[PDB]
Coordinates of C-alpha atoms in Angstrom, one line a residue:
Chain A
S1 CA 61.1 86.4 -91.7
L2 CA 60.8 84.2 -88.6
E3 CA 57.5 82.6 -89.5
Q4 CA 58.5 81.3 -92.9
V5 CA 62.1 80.4 -91.9
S6 CA 60.7 78.4 -88.9
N7 CA 58.1 76.7 -91.1
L8 CA 60.9 75.7 -93.6
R9 CA 63.1 74.5 -90.7
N10 CA 60.3 72.3 -89.3
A11 CA 59.3 71.0 -92.7
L12 CA 63.0 70.1 -93.5
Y13 CA 63.4 68.3 -90.2
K14 CA 60.2 66.3 -90.4
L15 CA 60.8 65.3 -94.0
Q16 CA 64.3 64.2 -93.0
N17 CA 62.8 62.1 -90.2
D18 CA 60.2 60.5 -92.4
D19 CA 61.2 57.1 -93.8
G20 CA 58.2 56.6 -96.1
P21 CA 58.1 55.9 -99.8
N22 CA 58.3 59.6 -100.5
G23 CA 60.8 60.4 -97.7
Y24 CA 64.0 62.4 -98.1
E25 CA 66.2 59.3 -98.8
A26 CA 63.6 57.7 -101.1
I27 CA 63.2 60.9 -103.1
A28 CA 66.9 61.7 -103.3
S29 CA 68.1 58.2 -104.1
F30 CA 67.1 58.8 -107.7
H31 CA 70.0 61.2 -108.4
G32 CA 73.3 60.1 -106.8
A33 CA 73.1 56.9 -104.8
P34 CA 72.8 54.0 -104.1
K35 CA 72.2 53.2 -107.9
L36 CA 68.7 51.9 -107.9
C37 CA 68.7 52.2 -111.7
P38 CA 67.2 50.4 -113.5
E39 CA 64.4 48.4 -112.0
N40 CA 65.3 44.8 -111.2
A41 CA 68.6 44.4 -112.9
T42 CA 71.7 42.3 -112.1
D43 CA 74.0 45.3 -112.5
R44 CA 72.7 48.7 -111.7
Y45 CA 73.6 52.2 -112.9
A46 CA 72.6 55.8 -112.2
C47 CA 69.3 57.3 -113.3
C48 CA 71.2 60.6 -113.6
Chain B
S1 CA 58.9 68.7 -84.5
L2 CA 62.2 70.7 -84.5
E3 CA 60.9 73.2 -81.8
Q4 CA 59.8 70.2 -79.7
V5 CA 63.2 68.7 -80.3
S6 CA 64.8 71.9 -79.0
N7 CA 62.5 71.9 -76.0
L8 CA 63.2 68.3 -75.0
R9 CA 67.0 68.8 -75.6
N10 CA 67.0 71.7 -73.3
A11 CA 65.1 69.9 -70.6
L12 CA 67.3 66.8 -70.8
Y13 CA 70.4 69.1 -70.9
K14 CA 69.5 70.7 -67.5
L15 CA 68.4 67.3 -66.1
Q16 CA 71.9 65.8 -66.9
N17 CA 73.7 69.0 -65.8
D18 CA 72.1 69.4 -62.3
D19 CA 72.7 67.0 -59.4
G20 CA 69.9 68.0 -57.0
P21 CA 67.9 65.8 -54.7
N22 CA 66.0 64.6 -57.8
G23 CA 69.3 63.9 -59.6
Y24 CA 68.8 61.9 -62.8
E25 CA 72.1 60.1 -62.3
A26 CA 71.2 59.2 -58.7
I27 CA 67.8 57.9 -59.6
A28 CA 69.2 56.0 -62.5
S29 CA 71.9 54.3 -60.4
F30 CA 69.2 52.2 -58.8
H31 CA 68.8 49.9 -61.8
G32 CA 72.5 49.0 -61.6
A33 CA 75.7 50.2 -60.1
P34 CA 76.9 51.4 -57.6
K35 CA 75.0 48.8 -55.5
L36 CA 72.8 51.2 -53.6
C37 CA 70.1 48.9 -52.1
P38 CA 70.0 48.3 -49.2
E39 CA 71.1 50.9 -46.7
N40 CA 73.4 50.4 -43.7
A41 CA 74.8 47.1 -45.2
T42 CA 78.3 46.0 -45.9
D43 CA 77.1 44.0 -48.9
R44 CA 74.4 45.4 -51.2
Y45 CA 72.6 44.3 -54.4
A46 CA 71.2 45.7 -57.6
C47 CA 67.9 47.4 -56.9
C48 CA 66.2 46.1 -60.0

């Protein structure tokens, strides 16, 4: 319904806006890009 | 928030759209072109 759909909409928008250590980009970078795997290596791969 | 985003977007949309005596474009032209200040003068200058 409207209440839950709007809460989800607001939550999505604010998590997208957030640029913290647990932001959307920080939490999604583990899967596809930009290859932050492993930690402190010359050549990096995917943690996928 | 997303609802606040919508509210501000609507407000700025009508502000840009209308051209009343409080016209946003007219009041913003002061800081630069089209050389409004001063009145009744052949040569003007930037109001800022």
